[PDB]
Paper text:
The UbiD family of reversible (de)carboxylases depends on the recently discovered prenylated-FMN (prFMN) cofactor for activity. Here, we show that the Pseudomonas aeruginosa virulence attenuation factor PA0254/HudA is a pyrrole-2-carboxylic acid decarboxylase. We here report that the UbiD-like Pseudomonas aeruginosa virulence attenuation factor PA0254/HudA is a close homologue of Bacillus megaterium PYR2910 pyrrole-2-carboxylate (P2C) decarboxylase and show that PA0254 is capable of prFMN-dependent decarboxylation of P2C as well as carboxylation of pyrrole. Substrate screening reveals HudA and selected active site variants can accept a modest range of heteroaromatic compounds, including thiophene-2-carboxylic acid. Together with computational studies, our data suggests prFMN covalent catalysis occurs via electrophilic aromatic substitution and links HudA activity with the inhibitory effects of pyrrole-2-carboxylic acid on P. aeruginosa quorum sensing.
Crystals obtained in the presence of 100 mM imidazole (acting as the buffering agent) did occasionally yield nontwinned crystals which were used for data collection and refinement. The overall conformation and position of the prFMN binding domain is highly similar in the four monomers present in the AU and resembles the closed conformation previously observed for the A. niger Fdc1. The density was modeled as an imidazole derived from the crystal mother liquor. In two of the PA0254UbiX monomers, the imidazole density was continuous with the prFMN density, suggesting a covalent bond between the imidazole C2 and the C1′ of the prenyl-derived prFMN ring. The electron density in the other two monomers was noncontinuous between the imidazole and prFMN and thus modeled as a noncovalent, stacking interaction between imidazole and the prFMN aromatic plane. In both the covalent and the noncovalent ligand complexes, the imidazole N1 is within the hydrogen-bonding distance of the N318 amide side chain. Hydrophobic interactions with Y279, W322, F432, and M434 largely occlude the imidazole from the solvent, with the exception of the water molecule hydrogen bonding to the imidazole N3.
Numbering used by the authors:
A (entry chain D): 1 to 496
B (entry chain M): 1 to 494
């Protein structure tokens, strides 16, 4: 379980041991069939499929779908996500967030540099690079291209060498040795590419695919600007990530990565990129010009495994990775700012388009505030952070509900948000531009989409509550609840 | 399965046969413990408990909890609800609504009057009535009193005999022969009670508990004013509900009812009633005066079964009966009005505080309208109906999503409702008074709580859609979906 956080291939073997992997020996087609199978996996919360035989691919190459999809067994539903951190099968949202925040306070552990690693078993330089020999999928029927990178991370470094950035972003196949993909300017790849542009230079770059599962997660996390993901990963697993130099450009990448691509990000050349089915659950019809990523060389492990994300309606890894990592970061932002927040959760059902903030009702009275002022304080703090910029809508609710349970968030939205008083739009705050409901007005302006929905009743700002909860937990005395819990299977219910 | 719609005792036996009833022979206390156990049932979607061994209660008397609670098996989740209509284990929300709507179109089938029936096996008159001998529960810790009636229906009739009304409402025990509970003026009990009061008279009344499951559902339904529930029930099951007359006041009640109460609703006498854990999930702290229901006589079957509802957080019968019934009625109301609506669903998770309307996107462009004007059209039509009065919030979304699935509703709310454009408050429209978020200013005005949340993208009003959906159903061609489903076991998924 622990080695799984640090070694993709081992992670795969451990899922199999958990009964959470299906070995697909059938020949499958990288043209849409992989994608369709993997979508059905997500939606049924089926085991992760390991595809062993992809039509017309490099012999022995493999593909892993649904690397952090959910399981149908509610008791173990988050286990595949949890395994990315070496956590056990029953770990839930709260356990994962608390782990990730402990790592934020721990001293970083820098990567350990090695001479050699399995990612070097096969090496393709220059004209030997032919990305089309990999099992590169056409993921959705209406996508603009096949995607090589949907579950790997970009690896760049500040010109000054002070900041090593690992970040997940998509990369479409353009040709035998060129990809293209977005570099949004508020993302760390955009920021670092701009630093190179100010020197007149393209950005040296690599991508790691089938990377250590914990590094993949951290690559998916909006850590603050200037924080090296590699050292955060070391802190989290409590030992260094072992890294090797690329063949051609001096970047350090994980030594046991399945597949490493290397080259540079062009200053000015672009290819029409996308569209792709995306995290919000939709497939917009038109692509946009995006920077070319020139692949100068690449290396891979024997029988290399390409993990993928078949993005779309929830739950897929834009929810279970992205969402979860955003949640942990936002709770840290919120607490460090002195907000009375004890949990944040980006509900997977809301497709990483809202974040629910659990409010410590024991702390709210002392603020001497009200809903509107509180909403504006939270909007400023949260949307102002690197992590909160990513999420357009915030819901604030008291911590009597569990924010990780959509049914309880629903109850609170319906029964606590007052139509006249509790819907706070923040149309001056700049938007994350992928948000699906933005209209042309919002796009021209760069703002319009942001919202806080308040589910704190007015009396909660005075430390009061209009009514108790009519539930087993809250409508019966403690000794009675224990008698019922104790006698339950003896009444006749057994396991029910 | 059809007999279950018509006979409570049979319905119980059928649940047991399906594996959906637990017989509790351990001794239990009606003071909270029954309540607590049955709350946990709902919450765990456990089978329904039949309690056979209750402290200090009439010998042979039984209590049924969670009469239409949900099951944990997702494929059979709604069976217990479905069985109220004689529908099979796999029946879902859409099947149920389709059946209830078919019954609206069908000619009423009036009840069949019988001389005799099992509810008359035991008769208590006058001084013989002692309601406290029953296993009358204290349902929640902070309730103001024990409730005799939480899963039974009031039976009254217009002074002119034209309208026979069956309707579910709570009744709190006051003493050995008096109960008390609300008769809110917009409900049919309240309306009919006011007709008697205009004659200077109390209203003759009975309550049926452990009544035929289909009659109970209908009693829970906001049929239009003047529509006799008993006729609708006969149209629904295809045959007469068999009824007998009460001992003392000429009302006709179902013949195989477990327990029938009868007396009258006082013109002016009140007792402090409530509070009670309620539909919306909460226990408010203070009770209010409500009319006395004088119990002159009662009758019951041997070994009578008292069914209860332990109201509160979802899903309980305020959701699965009440919400499901409202939903069916609202869909009829919408369609009769010419609204492009193909399903309505009061999500159980929202505790009967919102209704989700599935909009037929093929019909929307022809209206030549926009979100604000449509929301107002829908608000007027829906909130002005008897059914829609009851629900403060409406969500409008295109019918590409399945509105009976909360996860899909959430997706739409998160990804479609634009913060600047799609939040339509209707502060002049009169509220249902039980809505929990209402403030003092709303209560004094009698309005303020109503809202329409729009999740129709603007381009849907022109028949367009900015993007397709990236799912197994929508991102792959039909031949490929069929291939995947056909080869699923070949791939290794078993
Ligand atoms: C988990 C994950 C996160 C993706 C993502 C994917 C997944 C699977 C894909 C590849 C399926 C779909 C889109 N990816 C993009 C992405 N961010 C981005 O700027 N462009 C992307 O194309 N994100 C989010 C990004 O990885 C997080 O915002 C990180 O915080 C970025 O790292 P940074 O904070 O250091 O910039
Ligand atoms: K990152
Ligand atoms: K009714
Ligand atoms: Mn970063
Ligand atoms: Mn009626």
């Amino acid at each position: 379980m622990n080695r799984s956080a640090l070694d993709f291939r081992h992670f795969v073997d451990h899922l199999r041991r958990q009964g959470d992997l299906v070995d697909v020996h059938t020949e499958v087609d990288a043209n849409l069939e992989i994608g369709a199978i993997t979508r059905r996996v997500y939606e049924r919360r089926a085991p992760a499929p390991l595809f062993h035989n992809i039509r017309d691919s490099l012999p022995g190459a493999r593909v892993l779908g649904a690397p952090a999809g959910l399981r149908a067994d509610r008791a173990r539903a988050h286990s595949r996500l949890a395994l990315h951190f070496g956590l056990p099968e029953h770990s839930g949202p709260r356990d994962i967030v608390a782990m990730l925040r402990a790592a934020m306070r721990a001293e970083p552990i820098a990567p350990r540099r090695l001479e050699r690693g399995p990612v070097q078993e096969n090496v393709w330089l220059g004209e030997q690079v032919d990305l089309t020999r990999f099992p590169v999928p056409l993921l959705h029927e209406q996508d603009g291209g096949r995607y090589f990178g949907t579950y790997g991370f970009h690896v760049v470094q500040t010109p000054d060498g002070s900041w090593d950035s690992w970040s997940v972003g998509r990369l479409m196949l353009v040709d035998r040795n060129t990809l293209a993909g977005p570099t949004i300017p508020t993302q760390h790849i955009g920021i670092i590419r701009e630093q190179w542009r100010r020197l007149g230079k393209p950005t040296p770059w690599a991508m790691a695919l089938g990377a250590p599962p914990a590094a993949l997660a951290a690559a998916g996390m909006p850590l603050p600007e200037g924080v090296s993901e590699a050292g955060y990963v070391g802190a989290l697993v409590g030992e260094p990530v072992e890294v090797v130099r690329t063949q051609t450009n001096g970047l350090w990448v994980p030594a046991n990565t399945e597949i490493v691509l290397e080259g540079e990000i062009s200053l000015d050349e672009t290819a029409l990129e996308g569209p792709m089915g995306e995290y919000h659950g939709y497939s917009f019809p038109i692509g946009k010009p995006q920077p070319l990523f020139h692949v100068h060389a690449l290396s891979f492990r024997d029988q290399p495994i390409l993990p993928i994300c078949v993005a779309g309606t929830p739950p897929e890894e834009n929810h279970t990775i992205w969402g979860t990592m955003i949640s942990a970061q936002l709770l840290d932002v919120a607490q460090n700012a002195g907000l009375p927040v004890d949990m944040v959760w980006c509900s997977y059902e809301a497709a990483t388009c809202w974040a629910v903030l659990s409010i410590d009702v024991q702390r709210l009275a002392a603020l001497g505030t009200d809903a509107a002022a509180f909403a504006a304080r939270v909007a400023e703090t949260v949307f102002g952070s690197h992590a909160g910029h990513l999420v357009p809508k915030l819901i604030l609710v008291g911590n009597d509900i569990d924010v990780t349970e959509i049914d309880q968030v629903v109850w609170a939205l319906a029964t606590r948000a007052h139509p006249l008083h509790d819907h706070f739009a923040f149309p001056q705050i700049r938007d994350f531009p992928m948000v699906p409901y933005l209209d042309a007005e919002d796009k021209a302006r760069g703002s319009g989409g942001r919202l806080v929905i308040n589910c704190l009743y007015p009396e909660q700002f005075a430390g009061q509550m209009r009514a108790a909860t009519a539930s087993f937990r809250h409508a019966y005395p403690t000794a009675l609840r224990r008698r019922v819990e104790e006698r339950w299977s003896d009444y006749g219910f057994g396991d029910a």
